[PDB]
Design a protein around this ligand. Structure first.
Ligand SMILES: N#Cc1ccc(O)cc1F
Length: 185
């Protein structure tokens, strides 16, 4: 990830005018939609938290957890730490929390500035499947516009709901209780 850390704006977009900040969300949403499309229920939930982190969840199969035979870490960690892709989001997040529900098990992992704090670990059992990422954008990178703007997210998620017409997209703002549900049929 050092190439991204060296020139963040070249990977994510302008880091002073809010452009790059919102692009962080959109990169994560792309992966969540892909995951949701491979499942039965086909819903993603985007939440803006009161600490100005964002989470994206899907109810798909869960991203793969097995050890990548070539890299020697979990496949989820390969996705998060190898090179725009969610690895860029991770590199530019002061914290990122990953939760994967798959094959009867809950898996969790924490990153700080793209560095895993421990290996992906089984933490419990579950009947559900899906993936959730919550990220706190790094305030060492993102300046001036540091808070998410509901309308910027809503506009883009609406476009995505029409293109991905089988996918339900919920947007929730925990700062003021604002919510939308984009679903085309
Ligand atoms: N990477 C990734 C990713 C983030 C959120 C989600 O719901 C699914 C994903 F594959």
């Amino acid at each position: 990830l050092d190439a991204v850390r060296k020139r963040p704006g070249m990977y994510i977009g302008d880091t002073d005018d809010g452009t790059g900040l919102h692009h962080m969300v959109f990169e994560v949403v792309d992966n969540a939609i892909d995951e949701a499309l491979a499942g039965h229920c086909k819903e993603i939930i985007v939440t803006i938290h009161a600490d100005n982190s964002v989470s994206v969840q899907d109810d798909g199969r869960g991203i793969p957890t097995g050890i990548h035979p070539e890299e020697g870490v979990s496949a989820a960690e390969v996705i998060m730490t190898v090179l725009v892709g969610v690895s860029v989001v991770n590199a530019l997040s002061q914290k990122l929390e990953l939760v994967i529900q798959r094959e009867g098990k809950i898996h969790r992992q924490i990153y700080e500035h793209g560095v895993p704090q421990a290996p992906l670990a089984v933490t419990g059992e579950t009947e559900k499947t899906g993936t959730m990422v919550r990220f706190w954008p790094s305030l060492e990178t993102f300046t001036n516009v540091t808070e998410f703007e509901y309308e910027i997210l809503a506009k883009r998620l609406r476009e995505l709901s029409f293109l991905n017409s089988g996918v339900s997209i919920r947007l929730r703002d925990k700062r003021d209780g604002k919510e939308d549900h984009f679903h085309y049929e």
